[PDB]
């Protein structure tokens, strides 16, 4: 019963960013109908009704269009031109529903020399400087999973575009097309580095900056047990709290920001964190402003008190899944409805009156 | 002149996710007024009017509330309780404007055992399993910059919450509080891995999965010149195209998905990519679906045809910055207005009719 209660969304089944956007809409209360090819164990397909249609057939196109005629939002993540050839392109949908927000989720965008080329997250962040910046400096770049292209710079930007176009519709009375390209959204996601590059505050050298692992006060450390803590003590007063927790005398260490001595500083902090296990540090720093936290593996997360107490996760079935985010004080989101059986497309049409 | 034209936003000056959310609002056309302490070279502060006020004073609090009274959205990123203590808490704002979307940007959230504790991006993603999953398997975890907590799982969720709450207000006539905690938003951002963990499609072992650098067909490779390409050839037909371009005979290699022979497969791909420079592979794979792209450093991004042709960046006096995302067919966003001089707060009030 979240803030998107009442919003009608038609989702053309796809992979990665599209269904993630659709999931978040459903999480927040939207009525999302996913059209798939003629019960899922994919938790991402929570908060849906699933219908089936052959979009290449006359019948399937007609039904999809009747559904779209009644919706607020359409999500598609095919190659540019695919919906157009199916008879489901923006100009065709406009004929039946000029209030539709037509949301197009791609990596390279609707136009441009790479627009028809296959790719995945790693390719989109390769082209815009992001991938080059991730990883240790003495090694080739490492992919930050598909967190940055598919999701942070992908579905998240599709969602901002959908909801912004809905705001616009309040006064125009009309929808329009949202072109969310991972290559664009991930670039805005990393705008802080573009800003910092311009003022000398960030360099193109991998692994040699404040927030990429280059700084001894912003990195992970291996403990006695081979598990890790994360140190994020940027501000001097947090850095000071970190040293106090370690029992180190600041007068005997290199200054926090003397980069010429960062290897020496890191060596001293490495020795300190290596002297006890991760959970020892977890306890020492549990309540302080030192910005030191245990690095938990997925399987351990459900046992952490802050995670438990805030209900960041729920138990779906044979696994934890994240509860909806963000949170709303008045129209709070429900626990997600699990994936259910395929339902009849005509039953949905009856429900929506189309 | 983007879709958010007419939306009024008050930003209480902060660091990281708050200003990034405010930026994207302004990018898309919102009228964003940022209250600072009594010309910026920070490109993130594009698309604002900056005013100045001492929030701890009687005059400053009164002026802030007058502005807030006329706004749609307020963004604050302080420790929970700080705005309350200042007289700017949600209950105080409700008295002057019960249409206000009160957006609270934090790492740990408004409540819970860590709610008053300092932290940065690395700490939030340490506690929820994300950081553990990033990096090579034989090394300690590496921070994916602050892309995942501060932005992907942070400002992006604040934005979804703001715009979703605005949709809700169309029917209710009222605002509410958005509690965007990076610990929550980043967990939803990584929901695909929680889904996959439940069905045996992802493991807690770092560097040993399909999308974390574990798979030879989803990783970077060093070329002859010490620069890199990204390979994302997941689908068999894209994988085949990749091998074709490398001139490798598929019948002589281990099968793509025989994980027992992944080290053998990677060694063969490593030798192949090492035999020529990055530029060469760009030419070999330029118009193919091999999912092989050059890994560009920030400084080279502006020279890439796909980047140029789509105007993903614009030049600010000094350096490149990302254009607004996503894109809108009918109400297109303008090129961002650079940071400007501070203006009289009473000028803004007069403009807004406060």
Burial of A324 per CB tally in 10 Å (0-12, 13-18, 19+): buried
8-state DSSP, B335:
P
Kindly state the helix (H) or strand (E) to which residue A179 belongs, with its residue range: strand A176-181
Residues B66 and B172 in one domain: yes
Given a contact cutoff of 8 angstroms between Cβ atoms, the answer to whether B234 and B241 are in contact is no
Gap between the Cα atoms of B262 and B239, Å rounded: 14
Whether A70 maps to a domain, the answer reads: yes
SS3 state at A74? strand
Angle CA B317–B318–B320, to nearest 5: 95
8-state DSSP, B39:
-
Gap between the Cα atoms of B164 and B169, Å rounded: 9
Among B145, B176, B238, pick the best mutation site for testing chain A contact (most A Cβ within 10 A): B145
Given a contact cutoff of 8 angstroms between Cβ atoms, the answer to whether B273 and B248 are in contact is no
Q: Which residue on chain A is closest to B206 by alpha carbon? A: A297
Whether B238 maps to a domain, the answer reads: yes
Whether B98 maps to a domain, the answer reads: yes
Contacts of A348 (CB under 8 A, 6+ apart): A33, A49, A51, A67
Residues B37 and B69 in one domain: yes
Distance set, CA A328 to CA A21, A152, A250, A331, B110 (Å): 18, 21, 44, 6, 11
Residues A104 and A232 in one domain: no
Given a contact cutoff of 8 angstroms between Cβ atoms, the answer to whether B112 and A310 are in contact is yes
Binding site membership of A for substrate: which residues?
Answer: 37, 53-56, 77-79, 85, 119-124
Residue A255 belongs to domain with CATH number: 3.30.1540.10
Gap between the Cα atoms of B291 and B217, Å rounded: 9
Residues B225 and B189 in one domain: no
Residue A200 belongs to domain with CATH number: 6.10.250.260
Gap between the Cα atoms of B168 and B174, Å rounded: 8
SS3 state at B99? coil
Gap between the Cα atoms of A15 and A84, Å rounded: 19
Q: Measured in Å, how far apart are chain A's first and last C-alpha atoms?
A: 24
Residues A173 and A193 in one domain: no
Q: Which residue on chain A is closest to B123 by alpha carbon? A: A293
Contacts of B253 (CB under 8 A, 6+ apart): B243, B265, B268
Structure token pair of residue A149: 């292209």
Is A249 labeled as catalytic in the residue annotation? no
Residue in the structure block whose two tokens are 């052959």 = A54
Gap between the Cα atoms of B313 and B319, Å rounded: 10
Given a contact cutoff of 8 angstroms between Cβ atoms, the answer to whether A319 and B200 are in contact is no
Say how many CB pairs under 8 Å bridge A and B.
Answer: 499
Structure token pair of residue A288: 């302080």
Quote the crossing angle between the two packed helices B182-189 and B156-172, to the nearest 10°.
100
Given a contact cutoff of 8 angstroms between Cβ atoms, the answer to whether B333 and B1 are in contact is yes
Distance set, CA B232 to CA A6, A178, B215, B235 (Å): 38, 26, 10, 9
Angle CA B318–B323–B326, to nearest 5: 165
Of A152, A191, A298, nearest to B23 by CB-CB distance is: A191
Residue B138 belongs to domain with CATH number: 6.10.140.330
Given a contact cutoff of 8 angstroms between Cβ atoms, the answer to whether A307 and A256 are in contact is no
Q: Per the CB < 8 Å rule, is B147 touching A180?
A: no
Q: Which residue among A150, A184, A212, A219 is the active-site one?
A: A150
Spell out the long-range contacts of A273-276 with Cβ–Cβ below 8 A and sequence spacing 24 or more.
Answer: A273/A221, A273/A222, A273/A223, A273/A229, A273/A246, A274/A221, A274/A222, A274/A223, A274/A224, A275/A224, A276/A223, A276/A224
Sort out which chain B residues have CB atoms less than 8 A from A128's CB and list them. Answer: 296, 301, 307, 312
Residues A74 and A176 in one domain: yes
Phi first, then psi, for residue B104 (nearest 5°) are -110, 110
Whether A1 maps to a domain, the answer reads: no
Structure token pair of residue B289: 């679906």
Resolution (A): 1.8
Quote the crossing angle between the two packed helices A262-273 and A236-246, to the nearest 10°.
40
Whether B2 maps to a domain, the answer reads: no
Gap between the Cα atoms of A269 and A262, Å rounded: 10
Instruction: Tell me how close the Cα of B153 comes to any Cα of chain A, in angstroms.
Output: 7
Structure token pair of residue A115: 């627009």
Residues A267 and A282 in one domain: yes
Whether B106 maps to a domain, the answer reads: yes
Given a contact cutoff of 8 angstroms between Cβ atoms, the answer to whether B97 and B166 are in contact is no
| Radius of gyration of chain A, Cα coordinates, nearest whole angstrom | 24
Q: Per the CB < 8 Å rule, is B198 touching A163?
A: no
Residues A19 and A104 in one domain: yes
Residue count of chain A, please give it.
354
Full domain range(s) for residue B193: 182-204
Residues B142 and B212 in one domain: no
CB atoms within 10 A of CB B271: 12
Give Cα B26 distance to the centre of its chain. Answer: 15
Angle CA B90–B18–A46, to nearest 5: 85
Sort out which chain B residues have CB atoms less than 8 A from A114's CB and list them. Answer: 306
Residues A156 and A32 in one domain: yes
Q: Per the CB < 8 Å rule, is A327 touching B129?
A: no
Q: Per the CB < 8 Å rule, is B41 touching A198?
A: yes
Residues A33 and A177 in one domain: yes
Q: What is the 3-state secondary structure (H, E, C) of B14-26?
A: CCCHHHHHHHHHH
Structure token pair of residue A327: 């949170």
Dihedral Cα A80, B335, A151, A341, nearest 10 deg: -50
Give the count of domains, chain A.
Answer: 5
The b/e string for A249-285 (b: 16+ C-beta within 10 A; e otherwise) is: eeeebbebeeeebbeebbebbeebbeebbbebbbebb
Whether A2 maps to a domain, the answer reads: no
CB atoms within 10 A of CB B57: 12
Residues B133 and B12 in one domain: no
Is A150 labeled as catalytic in the residue annotation? yes
CB atoms within 10 A of CB B226: 10
Whether B1 maps to a domain, the answer reads: no
- Any binding-site annotation on B53? yes
């Amino acid at each position: 019963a979240g803030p998107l209660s009442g919003l009608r969304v038609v989702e053309l089944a796809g992979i990665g960013p599209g269904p993630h956007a659709a999931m978040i809409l459903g999480d927040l209360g939207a009525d999302v109908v996913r059209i798939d090819r003629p019960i899922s164990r994919d938790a991402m397909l929570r908060n849906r009704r699933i219908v089936t249609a052959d979009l290449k057939s006359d019948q399937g196109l007609e039904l999809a269009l009747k559904l779209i005629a009644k919706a607020d939002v359409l999500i598609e993540g095919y190659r540019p031109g695919v919906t157009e050839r199916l008879g489901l392109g923006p100009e065709e949908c406009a004929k039946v529903n000029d209030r539709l927000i037509y949301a197009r989720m791609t990596g390279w965008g609707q136009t441009g020399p790479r627009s028809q080329q296959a790719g995945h997250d790693i390719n989109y962040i390769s082209l815009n400087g992001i991938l080059h910046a991730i990883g240790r400096g003495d090694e080739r770049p490492v992919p930050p999973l598909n967190l940055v292209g598919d999701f942070g710079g992908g579905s998240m930007f599709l969602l901002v575009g959908i909801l912004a176009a809905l705001w616009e519709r309040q006064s125009s009375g009309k929808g329009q097309v949202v072109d969310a390209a991972m290559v664009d959204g991930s670039s805005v996601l990393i705008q802080m580095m573009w800003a910092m590059r311009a003022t000398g505050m960030w360099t193109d050298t991998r692994g040699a900056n404040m927030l990429d692992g280059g700084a001894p006060y912003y990195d992970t450390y291996e403990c006695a047990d081979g598990r890790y803590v994360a140190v994020g003590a940027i501000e001097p007063q947090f850095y000071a709290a970190m040293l106090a927790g370690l029992g180190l005398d600041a007068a005997e260490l290199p200054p926090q920001n003397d980069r010429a001595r960062w290897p020496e500083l890191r060596a001293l902090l490495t020795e300190a964190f290596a002297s006890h296990d991760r959970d020892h540090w977890g306890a020492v720093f549990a309540n302080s402003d030192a910005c030191v936290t245990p690095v938990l593996a997925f399987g351990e997360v459900h046992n952490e008190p802050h995670i438990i107490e805030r209900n960041t996760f729920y138990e779906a079935n044979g696994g934890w899944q994240p509860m909806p985010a963000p949170r709303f004080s008045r129209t709070a989101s429900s626990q997600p409805r699990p994936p259910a059986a395929t339902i009849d497309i005509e039953a949905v049409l009856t429900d929506w009156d189309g």
